[PDB]
Structures are given as structure tokens and as C-alpha cells.
Amino acid sequence: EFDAIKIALASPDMIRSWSFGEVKKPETINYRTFKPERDGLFCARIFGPVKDYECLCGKYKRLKHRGVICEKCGVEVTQTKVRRERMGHIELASPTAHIWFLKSLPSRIGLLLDMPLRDIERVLYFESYVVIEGGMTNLERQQILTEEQYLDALEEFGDEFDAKMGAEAIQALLKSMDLEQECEQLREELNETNSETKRKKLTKRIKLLEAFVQSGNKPEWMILTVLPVLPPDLRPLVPLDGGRFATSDLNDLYRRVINRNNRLKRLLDLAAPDIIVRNEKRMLQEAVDALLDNGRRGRAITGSNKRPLKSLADMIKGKQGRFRQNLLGKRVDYSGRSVITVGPYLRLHQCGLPKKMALELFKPFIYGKLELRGLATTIKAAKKMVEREEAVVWDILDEVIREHPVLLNRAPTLHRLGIQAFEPVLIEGKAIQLHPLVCAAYNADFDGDQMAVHVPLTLEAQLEARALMMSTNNILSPANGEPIIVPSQDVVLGLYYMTRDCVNAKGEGMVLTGPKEAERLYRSGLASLHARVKVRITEYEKDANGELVAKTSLKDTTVGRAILWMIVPKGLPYSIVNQALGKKAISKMLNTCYRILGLKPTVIFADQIMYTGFAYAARSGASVGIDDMVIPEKKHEIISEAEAEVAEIQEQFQSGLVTAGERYNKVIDIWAAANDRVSKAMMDNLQTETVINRDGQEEKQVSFNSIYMMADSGARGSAAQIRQLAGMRGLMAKPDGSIIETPITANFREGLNVLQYFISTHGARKGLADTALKTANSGYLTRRLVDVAQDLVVTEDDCGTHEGIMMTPVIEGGDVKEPLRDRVLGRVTAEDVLKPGTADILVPRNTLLHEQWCDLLEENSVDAVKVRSVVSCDTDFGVCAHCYGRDLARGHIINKGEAIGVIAAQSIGEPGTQLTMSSIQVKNKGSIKLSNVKSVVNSSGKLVITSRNTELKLIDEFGRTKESYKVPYGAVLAKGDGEQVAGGETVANWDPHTMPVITEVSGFVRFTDMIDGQTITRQTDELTGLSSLVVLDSAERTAGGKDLRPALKIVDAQGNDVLIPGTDMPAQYFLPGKAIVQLEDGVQISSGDTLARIPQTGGLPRVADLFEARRPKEPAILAEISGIVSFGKETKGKRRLVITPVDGSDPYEEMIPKWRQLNVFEGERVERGDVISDGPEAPHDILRLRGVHAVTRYIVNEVQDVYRLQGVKINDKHIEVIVRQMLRKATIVNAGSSDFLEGEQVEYSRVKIANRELEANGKVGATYSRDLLGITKASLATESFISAASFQETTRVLTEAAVAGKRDELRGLKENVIVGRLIPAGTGYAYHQDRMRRRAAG
Amino acid sequence: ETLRVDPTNDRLSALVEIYRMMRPGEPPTREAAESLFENLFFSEDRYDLS
């Protein structure tokens, strides 16, 4: 057993202590007798014997002597398995550089020595010298030279200085430096130069030096002098059938190293010239680099078939490395697969399994059972009995599979309902039989799909397959709490045909005694299923304490509903079957049956519904013919009446009355209108066109047309497809996105042209090609979500906070899109909310809001509840059960030990394949309410407001907000506040291409703040004669003029600036360029007059950008702190802006380009967070200025905006889990005796539990800021290197973990999957807990 | 205006600069550059527009 995993650098002595001897030559094996040659790469004296308990010569054998070492051949007598464990080594004749610690950016050598990469890569190729010692001279350490300057220094200084070349120089540099002294001298000499640009690199270098000092490594071990050699059985040399051999590539890469090292050991004995020894050292360096990482430092060495050779680093990383191919998913025994087909007679817990598959998968069970009954003497006779297929084998098989579940699985597995457990029923034939009700969780059908079969072997696996995964526990969805077993295609059609009615049906009028008599009359041929009758019916209810009370009546109904009522269980009202049922009504039936009665009645009721639907669909006789597609008789005239209009709109273009663009854009809509007319004529001629007469004469009723019947019931189809069957097809797009002019005026019942067919193929291929190239983006997103969320598990029962989040309905974009009931069902209340009076307590203030509480909330009217959330949980390393709420697939409080992260990721990722990739009116009557407002009366008897960010709400009968808008700034409110206005009434009027900005108070306007020669012209409208000093563009700019940006201001009878009530305010605002102002000089105005005006992607990409926390390319600018705004020093790179607190310091001022139109004038007072411009907001700013709840709310609303637009239902805590995982890091601002640095990035939980102990015994803690990382940057920044290494970028993760000296504690799920242990979630949660208790014991 | 960002003044400097581009890491001579440029697009045995 073990508890952790470590990683570090390896010294030469460590590499020599792993090995069993030195490899000295490239010999692999002998060419006549294929035996391993001595001292080569497959040597049997170093690496172990090639047969069990035999030496190589043949002298020793037979397991008598087990530890002897033969004296002839040196092989020891032992088992050959040891050729997978023993290593060797190679002693290099000159040191070489490890390529990982040199060329993985940032380089660790260049960061440790503070040298550029160019200088090092020049000293390493014998191309320049480097000074190691200065002696007493002008030259200093790490100075770079050339040959001539080296000769000059030699003949001038002589012996005192020291200069070298190659990896020996760099090893001497790394070996001589002192780390503690250097880091401490980086400490006190940073505070002066703690400027940011130097701050980042200085603190990075400081933490690197400190890591080397504390970890125990030495900086010179990054230069190799001894090399290890992998065991032979992991790089084998193997014969094929035919005498041919096959080999690994590491052999090819090791031979080059060995026989370039031997040549250098020769040249160093012949005492050759240095121009040749240098070439050898370069070649040795290149060979070792290609053995470690092939294509990194140059061209890739290729083999004799012109493909690059694979290296030690390509066997670990990538989609086909060890991690993703052999450790996170494997191939398994006891498994099979086959084609699936439907069996409609099965129960919900049953599957049909062929006899031959089951005989193969269950062989050891059958052998043991056979030799227990004495039917066979030994296992080898049992084998032949089974192989002959005697008759008793088939009777042993039937009692082996009795009460043995079997797991079925279909790929791709998008969520956990892709694997389910069944009980097998032996069949003849070769295809597997599946129940018709589970094909919706699998996404399966019978056009050729195939499924896989797995057999659990042990007692615990059988218990878990029965209790957790059996198909009769999985009726609800885990994403939303809805049922998943709804009936799809012919259950629906049969139940809909049996509960319809008809006029003048045979047997109309009778009075019957009960359902049994209606059935007996239908079977006999006396009544019809659609006949209107009167039946006596008994129904039950429960208002007693768990008991049922009955009551009988006479009801008016049809025969078919009375027949169906014999299926419904006791305790449901009759009004559920008295409709004409469709898919929605049947789903309602199943859901109310689950809410009232429970699980087992529901799983019996679903089966009964399926059987009776199939039976009556069969008896109906529904078919499809060519006459069932009815084309309306007035299409041929709508078409001509559109063609005449397009002709008479072409001839207004041939005579120069209309442009080409408007001509096209008018033909488009005069064809769209005719298409809509045709479609509505078609649909009205088809839907109720039945004239069936009655006892005296004719009347109308709904149609019994087959196509209409299967479209209207929800079995198969829609209106958009009958439109193409019987209407016209419509308008087609080019592959560009442009729409062709002439539409397709034909349908499929009539037949297309060559040309209409040709132009219809474009969109078909475009859709088919988008599907295949979207599935990859969806899968990659799911994998990143699973990797960020995998280690989050419900750990505790109650953390005890009072925090929460405020849930209200969403009413924007129109009507109420999401009620309050759908957003609090299941959550736990954060505070003791009270119905809209005072002290209307419903709560112990921890209350699981089940359906009765939601009904109580809706019989009153409350529209805001404070609830609990995971992004505010106080538990570290997990969540508590009360902050999470309800288990959405079980219907009760979540259990402690549940893996909520994998469920969140799977629920968000599964639907990703369906994503696409001038005046205010009021509807209904209610009060009008305003917020965030500041008002003034107008000159024309109306309301105006001087607020930019106000909100206008509509109040209902009881005071629940039904609609909410916001008005543009400067707009004039047509009517005031507190009004009960009816619908159809406008409340505010704004211009569609303009917005005015108004004065403050009635005063006297003066033309000031502008001269002639300024950004002002004297441009007067020559035809009408109205002009103020008008503000200009930058094309008419006079740079010397913009000394003061023009604005016409308001003065008193004093000639000076007007009072503003409440504060000594300047009454007038200076406006940016190109302003339209035509207000007269000398013609004064009143308060609120027109002084100036303002002239003027969804799908998977947006979801990925939200979770990755991208930054928009036009981000809005917000107020850093609260203060009075003004323009700053005006350094004209581009504009400068400052704000000033009324009490505090104001060193903060920064840059704004003049393209960015400002909406805050020099007299404004802003609070923290409000906008200074418009544009999409950036989430890091929302987290810095406003808190955590603001960025949570923004992210969840912007994500749900995309899913709701398509009809996809996902609960909202599944996004809160991801948002919690993106917020795990904190950054330190002021340490204060906290053992942390001053701008280091730490885990948030470490800071929290450090400050909770410092503050415990009376000390000052640390101060910090929160951070927001994307999902792939937060997956890689976790504190376990095995999860990060197995996710992505294995090279960077492993080099950084190696030089840092990290360790791993195996706390997530993936760490325990890699080493084959029980995960800490589920039925394995208790086990780990007990182990953790022993961690406190020792 | 293109002519005013060139560091070249005549045929030899241009050939030397092309040589420095195609084969970095050695100084050329008056014949190596001319032969390299005459091999690229103007010799029927290393170029063929079909």
C-alpha cells in the first residue's frame, strides 16, 4: 500500500542505482541462432534470462537452484518476467543538455542563470566562448566572446581568467552559483524597482530559486552525464509468421547514441584535431535530443520508410499516449455485442439474450455448476460436454442466469442513462431484444444500431447493478426532474384514436352500468368506440390520513374512455381520461401518477399504457395513400396573383423608378406573403373538413384524415412538413447565405424540376456537413467541463451560512419567460421569507420547497425569495447537502457522497448537439412604477427625467411585476408616476434616430466656451435660417481650436452660472464632437428644453466563450470608484479621464480613445460599477467591481439565454457548479504576518483556513482578491499534477512539477481511476473515510 | 514608395540578400549567389510549368 506519489529530478547516483549493468555495444541478437549477444541491447546477463529457470548456455535448469549465478554465461537462474523490470545505463563521454529543461518555454536554465536563450544556444554549438571566472581583470562572469577576443585575452591576461565552450561551460556556470545569497539579494533590491514590468519577472525568479532551495534538487542535474536504458520487454524484437521480424523505434534511437558515443571515446584517444572532436560532440548532443523528444530542436530524424521515428515523449502524450489509451479506458473480458431488435412483450426490467452469446459469456459459472452436480468428473470433461452442447448444459444455463443482471450499453454515451442493467430472458436467434420504452434514453432505434453486453462478476457488483442501475429506478431525468419513459409513436396514435369522438356514431345515446359493459358492447359489434354515451363511474380520492374515499356518479363520455378507465389505478380523478389524449396529456398522466402514488404503480401503469396503445393502434388500420395529401384548389390563383405583382414591380425598375436593392428586397416579401396565404388555405381545407350529417342534417367536426391525425396527436410530423407535402416548398438560400429570387412553387406530391431540385441540393448538403463538423466541438467542450468539475462531491450535511442568492422570475424580452415556481422548486430557503404583509412566517428557515410550499407561495403572491447556493457554501473541499437541495432524479434531499460535478458536466454537455452553432406600448392595465430616477417638469406639461439608468415597471392587481423596460436618457415621459393606465396607451416617446439631452433649470442661455476658429463653424441652414454654434467632426477639426470643447451654458440675471438646488453645481455640460445644436442666441428657453441631441452570435460558440471567460473586443468602461468625473491632463496619445472622491485620494486616471463615445459629463457623480460607455461587459470587471453573486447571475442568465431559445430544459445549479469551479484562486494584496507573498497567487481555501487560525489566537490575517479563470486554464492550475498531466500539455506539467518537487495525494476521482482503486464517491465513499481516520491515528 | 524601404542598391547586394534568405548561416561569394538564383526559376531541370 501507499498514500502519495512524488516527482523530482534524478542525480547520476540515482540513475546508477536503478541499473543492473552498463550497455556497451549495439549488438541485438545473433543472426543464425537468435540468442542475445553479450553486452548489447538485449543482453541476458544484464536484463535476465529468456526462459523460466534456465541459463543461456544450458548448464543449469529445473528450479532446484533458484539463486545461483552461472559461472560460464553469468545469467542467473530465475523467471523471465524480470525482463520487464530491470534497467541499464550508458556512461556518456561528454555531458549533454536535457532538452526539456532547455526548450520548454520559459527555459529553466535561462531563468536560473538569467541568460537569453540565444547566448546559451550559441555556447552549446561550440560557436562562442563564455567567461566562467573573471579573476582580476575587466572581463566578468557570463560574458560572451568570440575566438579572436579569446586569443586577445589569452595573450594579454593569460592564466587568470577562465573561458569555456559547450555544455561543460554551462554545467560549470550552473554548478558554481549560490542560490540563497542570490535570492536574498533579489529580496531587498526589488522594493526600489518594484515597478510592474520588473515586478513580475523578479517575483517569478524569486519563487524559482526558492523552489530549488526547498525541494532538495541541485541545479546542475539538468545536464546529463549518465543515461538510463528501458527494459527489453517494453521495446521488443519479435518474430512474425514467415521468419520476418518486427521491432520498436527506441532500438533505432538507442543504437545511434551508443555508436556515436563509442566514436568519441576513440577520437579522444587518437588525440585528433579539435575541429573533429567538436563535430562529434555536436552529433552526440543531437542524437540524445532525438532520443528524448524528436521534432523539438530541428528536423525530425526519419526511418527507412520516410516516417519520423517515435520517441520516449510520444509514448506518453497525446490522444494515443499511455494516459488516454491505456489508463483511462481499457479493453475488457466477459463482454460481447450484437444487433438489436424490438420485443414488444417484455416487462420493463427484462431484455432478451441469445442462447449462444450467453453460453460463451458464462463459461466458468457453467463449469463450476456442472462439476458440483457430479455430472462431470474434472474441468476438462466439463469443457467437452459444453463443446458438444448436450441437453443438460441448457438446463444448467437456465439456472445460472436466474437472478443475474446484465449491463447493456450503446455508444456514444452522452449521459448516465446510456448504461443500464436488465434481467435476461434466453431466446433463439442472434439479435438482442430491447423494451420499446427505453429507446429514448439510449437514443436508439432499429435501422441497424448495435449494442454491447457486459457481465458483472462479484457480489458487490451484482448488488450495485440491482439497486442503482436497474431500469426501473431510472424513470426521471437527472438534468431536469421530468419523466424519461414517455410513450412515443404508436402508443400515442392508438390512445388518441381510442379517445376521440364522432357525430352520429353507431350506438349513440345508450346508458351503461360501468366500463365492463362498454367493453362487452364494443367487442360484440353493437357500439362504436367513438359513440356518445352515459356511464356510471366510481372514482377514489384521498384527503384522509392516508386512506381512500370513494364516490360514484353518472358521466357523459364515449365508449373508448370508459374502456381506458379500467387501466388507471385507484386514487386518480376521472378528468384525466375524459379528453382526447395526445403526447402532452399522457406525459401529464404519468407525472401526476408519480406525484400522488409513487414509483411501483407508475412502472406498472406505463406497461399497461404501452400494451393497450399497441393493441388499439393495430385495430384502427391507419394507412397512408396518395389521396390523403390534399392540395387546396385556390393555390393556382395565389401564384398568378403574385407573379403579376412581381412583373409590375420589375417594370418600375426598367423605367428608373426604383433601385436594384429595393427591387430585390420587395420581390422577396411579395413572395413570402403568397407562401403564407397558400399554407393557411391548405391547413384550413384539411383540419376540420368533414361534413358528416346527423339525425336531421349536416354539421362540421375535426377530420379523420390519416396525415392530420398523426400530425395533430404528436406521433410523427409537424405543420412545417405537411407544408412541403401539400403546400409549396418556398424560398431557397445560396451556399453564401443569399436568398434566390424565384421560389420553389411546387411540392412533393406534384414533383420538382431539374432546376428546383438542383437548387434544393445546396441546403441539404450544408446541413449534412454542419452536423458532422459540429459533433467534434460538442465533444471537446464536454471533455473540458468534465475535467474542471470532476473532483467536487457532497461532503457535509450543513455548513451553517446565512448567505444566498435572490431568485425572481425573468420578465424581460416580453412576457414572463420563466415563472418563479420553476426556479425555487427543490431549493432551500436562506432566510425566513414572509407573505407580502408582515411576519407571515412559513419557515423553520431551512425548508426544502416541495410542491405544497410552491402552491402556498402562488396562492399568495410573492415574487422574490432568498435561497441557498453552492457558489456561497462555506464548506471547503466540497459542498453541503443543504446548499445543493434536491436530487433531481430521486425527488428528495441529496445524499452525502454524491458526485455532482460529473452530473453537472454531463447534463450541460449532452444537449449541445441541438444548438444551432420607437415607442413603449403597454398590453394590460396596472400601476406604473419607476426606479433609479431623478425627475423634472417640462415646459409642455409632461414629465422628463435626468437619469440614465432608470427602470419602468408595470404592477398587477396584487403587486407582482409583469413587465419591465428601461427608457433612454433624455427621453420625455408622456405621463407621470403612480398611474393605473390601461393597455394600448403609450407612456414614453423617443426619436428612432435621435435622443435629446436637456437643460437643468430655467435660465438665460449664453454662447460661451467656444470661439471662431474652434471646432465650431458658422454653418447656417441657408434655406430655413436656424443655426447655433454647431459642433464638428474631426475632418473639419482645428487642433488649436479644441483648447476648450464647445458648450453653450446657462446664466442668471447675474450673467454668471445658475444655482442648482441642493449643490453648488455648474449647470451645463460639454458634449463630444459632431453635435447637432441649433438653439438661438438671445432666444431663451425654459427648464427641460431641447438644447442638444444625440444622433446615430449564439449556439455552441457563445457557450464556449462564456465558460472560457473570453474578453470582448469592445468592452464597456466602468467606474473604478465613486467620485466626481472630469477630464484629466489631456496627453494626446488619446483622451484622458479622471474621477475624484469627495474625501479620498484620486491617483487613478486613464486612457479613452475618442471613438469611444462617453455618456458621462464633467458634472456627473458616479458610483462604483456604473458604465462610462456602452458595449458588452467583461466578466473580470464584473467580479472586481461587483461581488461574486453578480458574476454568477450574469453567467447563468447569459447561458440560459441560449438553451431556452431552442427548447432545452436544464436546471440552474448545474451551471452554478461550474461557476464555483472557475473561482478557486485568490491573489494576495497585503500579507500581514501570514507567511504569504505580496502578489503571489494562492488557492482560496488555503488562505481561508490559514486566516481562520491566525485570527484564532489574536493575530492580523491576510487580505486578498478573487480571480476568474476559464475552464481550461483552471483545469491546468489544480494542485495535483497527475490530473493535469493526463488532461493536456503533458510536457509543461511534468517539467514544472519536476523542478518544483511536488507530490500528489490522490483525492480526486481520476487519480484513483489511474491506479485502479475505489473512487471516493458513492459506495466507495465510506471506505476512504475510514482510511482517512487512520491518517489521524498513524 | 516600395523602392524606399530596400537596403539594396544593385545586382550584387540583391543576390546576396536572396542568398542570405534561402540559406542562413554563411557568407556567400560572387558565384554561389548567382548560381543559386539561376537555379530557382530559370533552369529546365529544376522547374517545369506543365
Binding site: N279, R282 | G25
Partner: peptide, 12 residues
């Protein structure tokens, strides 16, 4: 030196 090839580094 704007090159990393050892055959050119030799022939130079």
C-alpha cells in the same frame, strides 16, 4: 548564428 544544422556548421 541563424542556423542550427550541424552539416552546415561543419562545412563552414
Amino acid at each position: 548564428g541563424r542556423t542550427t544544422d550541424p552539416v552546415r556548421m561543419y562545412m563552414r
